[PDB]
Amino acid sequence: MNDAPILAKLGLSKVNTYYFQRRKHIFALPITIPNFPLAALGIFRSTDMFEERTLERYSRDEREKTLGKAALLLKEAKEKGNYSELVRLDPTDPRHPYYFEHPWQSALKMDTVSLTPYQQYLRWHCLTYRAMHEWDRQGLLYDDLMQPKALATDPFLEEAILRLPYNQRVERERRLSRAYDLALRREYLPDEDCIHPEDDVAYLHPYYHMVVDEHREQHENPVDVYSR
Amino acid sequence: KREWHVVPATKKFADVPTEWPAKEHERFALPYGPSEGRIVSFMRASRIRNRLLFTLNPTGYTEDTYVTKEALRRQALAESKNLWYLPERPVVADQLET
Amino acid sequence: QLRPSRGAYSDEFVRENYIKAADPEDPYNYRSRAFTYAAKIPMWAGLLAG
Amino acid sequence: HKVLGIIIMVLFLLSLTNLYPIYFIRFYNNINILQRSLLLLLLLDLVIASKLCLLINHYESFYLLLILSILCVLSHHIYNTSFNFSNSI
Numbered sequence: 001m002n003d004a005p006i007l008a009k010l011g012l013s014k015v016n017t018y019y020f021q022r023r024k025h026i027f028a029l030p031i032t033i034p035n036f037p038l039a040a041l042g043i044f045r046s047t048d049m050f051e052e053r054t055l056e057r058y059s060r061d062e063r064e065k066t067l068g069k070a071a072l073l074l075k076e077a078k079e080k081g082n083y084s085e086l087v088r089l090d091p092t093d094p095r096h097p098y099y100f101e102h103p104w105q106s107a108l109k110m111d112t113v114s115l116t117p118y119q120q121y122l123r124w125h126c127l128t129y130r131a132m133h134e135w136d137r138q139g140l141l142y143d144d145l146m147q148p149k150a151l152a153t154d155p156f157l158e159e160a161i162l163r164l165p166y167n168q169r170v171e172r173e174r175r176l177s178r179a180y181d182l183a184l185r186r187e188y189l190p191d192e193d194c195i196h197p198e199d200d201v202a203y204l205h206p207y208y209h210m211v212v213d214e215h216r217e218q219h220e221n222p223v224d225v226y227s228r
Numbered sequence: 229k230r231e232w233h234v235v236p237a238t239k240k241f242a243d244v245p246t247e248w249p250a251k252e253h254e255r256f257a258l259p260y261g262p263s264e265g266r267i268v269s270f271m272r273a274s275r276i277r278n279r280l281l282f283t284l285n286p287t288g289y290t291e292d293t294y295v296t297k298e299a300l301r302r303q304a305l306a307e308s309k310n311l312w313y314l315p316e317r318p319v320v321a322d323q324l325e326t
Numbered sequence: 327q328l329r330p331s332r333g334a335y336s337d338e339f340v341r342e343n344y345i346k347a348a349d350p351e352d353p354y355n356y357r358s359r360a361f362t363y364a365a366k367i368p369m370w371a372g373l374l375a376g
Numbered sequence: 377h378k379v380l381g382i383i384i385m386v387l388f389l390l391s392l393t394n395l396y397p398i399y400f401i402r403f404y405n406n407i408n409i410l411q412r413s414l415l416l417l418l419l420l421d422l423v424i425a426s427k428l429c430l431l432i433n434h435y436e437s438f439y440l441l442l443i444l445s446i447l448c449v450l451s452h453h454i455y456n457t458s459f460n461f462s463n464s465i
């Protein structure tokens with residue numbers, strides 16, 4: 001990870017949070033249909049390790065990490081006086097407190113000495129499972145496939161898109177239209193234009209996470225118990 | 229009305245630590261992710277199973293007296309009045325969640 | 327490749343695969359129109375008889 | 377058990393729908409190769425279950441495979457629930 005050295009000095013782990021993922025519950029509630037009855041309970045689960053895992057953002061550890069990085073930025077601003085600059089970094093900057101990295105952005109240059117055999121399997125799986133879907137041959141980034149729906153829309157997602165800078169929004173739309181045109185013929189880009197895994201940047205996950213936190217803010221500081 | 233007497237501003241925050249990262253980050257390091265093993269994480273998730281987790285050691289602590297490594301690190305940071313330790317809000321739950 | 331400037335096919339490609347061969351004696355595509363309408367006739371014929 | 381069979385039938389038909397959750401926030405993510413492979417498995421299990429259900433009238437040993445196929449059918453995930461991952465208070 002490009003963020004790792006910072007995480008190194010805050011006493012955190014240099015390894016992606018994609019590892020350490022674990023099952024803590026038996027039943028998955030609230031039960032959601034249209035799963036089949038037994039599957040609706042969630043006793044037996046099928047995962048490909050590429051789920052969003054958004055609800056795990058409601059943790060004290062993640063907040064501590066975010067505030068540690070923010071405190072580093074504020075300390076630098078106090079020393080130098082470039083506060084403005086340091087609070088307007090692009091969320092793809094490793095110093096931004098909400099920096100997020102896909103597991104494959106560092107799977108090729110990972111330490112791999114501290115990984116459990118299960119975690120080594122996870123690394124190999126991340127690379128190969130990315131290769132299988134062939135969104136890298138469509139000239140597309142993974143976050144381009146995070147799109148909202150007409151009904152049951154993902155609210156955060158919509159906001160996450162409106163926070164993008166104008167040029168990045170336009171580039172996202174243009175990539176999506178090119179992928180649409182390619183998909184008409186089920187065509188791929190020339191083999192030299194394949195997306196390298198380290199180029200598959202997660203440019204929308206920081207905005208997504210910031211929106212999630214801002215939406216939970218008012219819940220934890222209620223005006224009153226029976227308040228909208 | 230005319231003469232402006234001088235008073236110190238941040239006198240309270242003098243001699244308090246101003247280093248960041250601090251010493252605690254070196255002595256509560258967690259280079260291997262969460263400090264709890266997978267099975268343990270599964271036990272502490274349920275209030276019932278949690279009771280079964282601490283009763284396996286009759287001479288061990290209880291739910292109200294067990295502290296995790298992350299909690300120890302946060303308490304250590306809080307105690308040392310570091311200037312740059314911005315405290316984090318614990319996850320607050322409404323009725324149904326509880 | 328992350329800042330596109332083109333769709334799927336380049337002009338050259340489309341000029342070699344999709345565009346019909348030119349007929350200098352027929353600059354108004356009477357041949358194409360005649361063929362397409364004649365080829366539509368059997369569809370209408372089958373539907374009518376059916 | 378007849379009552380249990382009726383209950384399972386009603387629950388099956390009701391769980392094919394998407395009427396719950398009603399007011400909890402839910403949204404649908406993408407689909408992947410694993411889900412498509414499991415969909416093929418669902419098709420296989422349904423067909424085998426039909427054939428075996430009709431065969432068991434003369435051959436008692438096929439009850440094992442009929443029950444196995446029905447169990448495999450009843451535990452098929454159509455909607456991958458983001459509630460599979462969360463923390464505890």
Ligand SMILES: CCCCCCCCCCCCCCCCCC(=O)OC[C@H](COP(=O)([O-])OCC[N+](C)(C)C)OC(=O)CCCCCCCCCCCCCCCCC
Nearest residue numbers: 361362363364365366367368369370371372373374375376
């Ligand atoms: C009205 C609803 C919408 C219809 C839209 C169009 C549907 C798709 C196109 C039609 C496809 C089928 C064409 C069949 C033609 C061949 C048979 C035929 O007519 O033979 C002529 C010949 C003509 O016989 P004849 O007796 O006149 O010939 C003279 C013979 N000598 C002198 C020796 C006695 O046979 C008949 O007409 C027999 C009676 C009518 C047979 C009808 C066949 C089935 C028609 C429906 C098939 C379509 C799918 C099912 C639809 C069901 C709807 C309820």
